């Protein structure tokens, strides 16, 4: 029967569709259901509750801070200076190297997006009797750079969009955080996984004490200020990219490869002690012996400009011991021809030291020497469990 001899169709081979996209297009595949019209229905009992919207999430109010307000708080005093951006953290204590963090529903997103451009808000739940009275400030001042984040009083805050709250028989209030930028949308503050590919927050709000609290003798003077954060009337979200937040399921990291940071061969074990050449024996530094100038020599850490470095041990059950396990430390040259391991209280105090040494500083400055651990913390002076693994943390500065 008849020959279709007219020229056949043309066609250009691809291999697979489609790791993107999925907004509006029909995706053909091989369904393992028995039917070609097999789409699951949702019965009256199997009710579709949500409402799976980026907005739906960025509207729940998640806790993020808790400030203790006291009568002792001066007329001129601040309570929190937390960042006005969705990527506002809350560190949770312990214990493994990488520290876990609390994040509002407006934190988990846009952890998935690049830009946001939104308006936000903070609910300040002030647990208070009717016999507690005070006044709090709160001001979104755009253009808060690094150094300029200090040099900040409650008076210059009154220069930008700010609010004062009177509390007698009305506990909480909600401040909507304005969005002042030169840029339409706002890129990630935390960019994962990439160090220099992360731009700071557009601004921050503070909560000063406009008027100190006056508590009558039958109600306590200290009071908790719980703080919640959610996307405001128009927190927008722009473009899906690599998430900046991880699981909570398996908080492990197989240390490649095997570039585990640990003391130079021969400097083990090592306890926290003192040294006449390190702040005149007034602060703790790792020593591999009790004799003359036996200070633990540590490998040099090659860090690219615009970053900082410190150390957190893998197992706390192998760290050197004083009054507490020195799980955190900072590494910097000692001038006597090597690098020394300087134990810190916690990761924050190790970071802050890296913010000052990599910020083009010295060791004999008062700003750094107030982050060094005092020598009365040396404790029983237990040595480590050999030369346990430390991992090198990284952060922009």
Partner 1 sequence: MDNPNPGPDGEGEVELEKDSNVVLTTQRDPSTSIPAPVSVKWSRWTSNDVVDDYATITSRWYQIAEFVWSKDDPFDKELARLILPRALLSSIEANSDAICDVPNTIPFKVHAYWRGDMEVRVQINSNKFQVGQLQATWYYSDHENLNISSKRSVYGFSQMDHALISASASNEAKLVIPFKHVYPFLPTRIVPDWTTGILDMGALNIRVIAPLRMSATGPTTCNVVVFIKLNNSEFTGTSSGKFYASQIRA
Ligand X SMILES: O=c1ccn([C@@H]2O[C@H](COP(=O)(O)O)[C@@H](O)[C@H]2O)c(=O)[nH]1
CA angle 202, 208, 213 (to 5 degrees): 160
User: Is omega for the bond preceding 110 within 30 degrees of 0, making it cis?
Assistant: yes
* Site size for partner 1 (CB under 8 A): 60
Residue 128: which of partner 1, ligand X, a second copy, none does it interact with, CB under 5 to 8 A by kind? partner 1
Using CB under 8 A, pick the residue from 217, 258, 259, 366 that binds partner 1: 217
CA dihedral sign, ordered 51, 54, 57, 59 = negative
Q: Is 355 helix (H, G, I), strand (E, B) or coil?
A: helix
Alpha carbon 173 to chain centroid, angstroms? 26
CA atoms of 204 and 206, how far apart (whole Å): 7
Token pair 């489609």 is at which residue? Answer: 18
Q: With respect to partner 1, which residue has the nearer C-beta, 21 or 52?
A: 52
Alpha carbon 27 to chain centroid, angstroms? 39
Least separation in angstroms between residue 346's CB and partner 1 is 18
Least separation in angstroms between residue 41's CB and a second copy is 13
Write out the DSSP string of 179-212. ---SSSS---SS-TT-SSS-PPPSEEEE-BEEE-
Chain residues 207-266 in contact with a second copy, contact rule CB under 8 A: 240
Residue 23: which of a second copy, ligand X, partner 1, none does it interact with, CB under 5 to 8 A by kind? a second copy
Using CB under 8 A, pick the residue from 2, 15, 45, 360 that binds partner 1: 45
Token pair 């009568």 is at which residue? Answer: 71
Q: With respect to partner 1, which residue has the nearer C-beta, 63 or 114?
A: 63
Cβ(397)–Cβ(355) below 8 Å: yes
Interacting residues with ligand X (CB under 6 A): 4, 6-7, 9
CA atoms of 109 and 54, how far apart (whole Å): 7
CA atoms of 112 and 99, how far apart (whole Å): 20
Q: With respect to ligand X, which residue has the nearer C-beta, 9 or 42?
A: 9
Each residue 53-72 as x (binds partner 1 by CB under 8 A) or -, in order, gives -------xxxxx-x------
Chain residues 163-202 in contact with partner 1, contact rule CB under 8 A: 171, 178-184, 199-202
Least separation in angstroms between residue 36's CB and ligand X is 21
Residue 130: which of a second copy, ligand X, partner 1, none does it interact with, CB under 5 to 8 A by kind? partner 1
52: contact with a second copy by CB under 8 A = no
Least separation in angstroms between residue 33's CB and a second copy is 6
- Find, among 88, 130, 87, 90, the residue nearest to 112 by Cα: 87
Chain residues 96-155 in contact with a second copy, contact rule CB under 8 A: none
Q: Is 348 helix (H, G, I), strand (E, B) or coil?
A: helix
Alpha carbon 181 to chain centroid, angstroms? 22
Instruction: Choose the stretch contacting partner 1; rule: CB under 8 A; options: 137-145, 276-284, 338-346, 360-368.
Output: 137-145
Using CB under 8 A, pick the residue from 71, 77, 125, 299 that binds partner 1: 125
Residues that bind partner 1 in the complex, under the rule CB under 8 A: 44-45, 47, 49, 60-64, 66, 90, 92, 102, 104-105, 119, 125, 127-132, 141-145, 148, 151, 156, 159-161, 171, 178-184, 199-203, 215, 217-224, 226, 228, 248-249
């Amino acid at each position: 029967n008849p020959s279709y001899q007219q020229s056949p169709r043309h066609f250009v081979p691809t291999g697979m569709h489609s790791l993107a996209l999925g907004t509006n297009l029909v995706e053909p595949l091989h369904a393992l259901r028995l039917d070609a019209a097999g789409t699951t229905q949702h019965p009256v009992g199997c009710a579709p509750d949500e409402d799976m919207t980026v907005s739906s999430i960025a509207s729940r109010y998640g806790l993020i801070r808790r400030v203790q307000w006291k009568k002792d708080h001066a007329k001129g005093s601040l309570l929190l200076q937390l960042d006005a951006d969705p990527f506002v953290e809350q560190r949770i204590e312990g214990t493994n190297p990488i520290s876990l963090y609390w994040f509002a529903p407006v934190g988990v997103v846009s952890s998935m997006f690049m830009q946001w451009r939104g308006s936000l808000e903070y609910r300040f739940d002030i647990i208070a009797s009717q016999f507690h009275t005070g006044r709090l400030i709160v001001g979104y001042v755009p253009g808060l750079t690094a150094s300029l984040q200090l040099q900040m009083d409650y008076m210059k805050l009154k220069s930008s969009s700010y609010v004062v709250f009177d509390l007698q028989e009305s506990n909480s209030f909600t401040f909507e955080v304005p969005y002042v930028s030169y840029r339409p949308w706002w890129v990630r503050k935390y960019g994962g996984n990439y160090l220099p590919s992360s731009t700071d927050a557009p601004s921050t709000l503070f909560m000063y004490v406009q008027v100190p609290l006056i508590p009558m003798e039958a109600v306590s003077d200290t009071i908790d200020i719980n703080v919640y954060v959610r996307g405001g009337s128009s927190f927008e979200v722009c473009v899906p990219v690599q998430p900046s937040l991880g699981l909570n399921w398996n908080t492990d990291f197989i240390l490649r490869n095997d570039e585990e940071y640990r003391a130079k061969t021969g400097y083990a074990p090592y306890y926290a002690g003192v040294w006449h050449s390190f702040n005149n024996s007034n602060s703790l530094v790792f020593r591999w012996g009790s004799a003359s100038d036996q200070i633990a020599q540590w490998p040099t850490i090659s860090v690219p400009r615009g970053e900082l470095a410190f150390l957190r041990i893998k197992d706390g059950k192998q760290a050197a011991v004083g009054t507490q396990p020195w799980r955190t430390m900072v590494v910097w040259p000692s001038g006597h021809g090597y690098n020394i391991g300087i134990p810190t209280y916690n990761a924050e105090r190790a970071r802050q030291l890296a913010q000052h040494l990599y910020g083009g500083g010295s060791l004999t400055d008062e700003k750094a020497k107030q982050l060094f651990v005092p020598a009365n913390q040396q404790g029983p002076g237990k040595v480590s469990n050999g030369n346990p693994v430390w991992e090198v943390m990284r952060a922009p500065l």
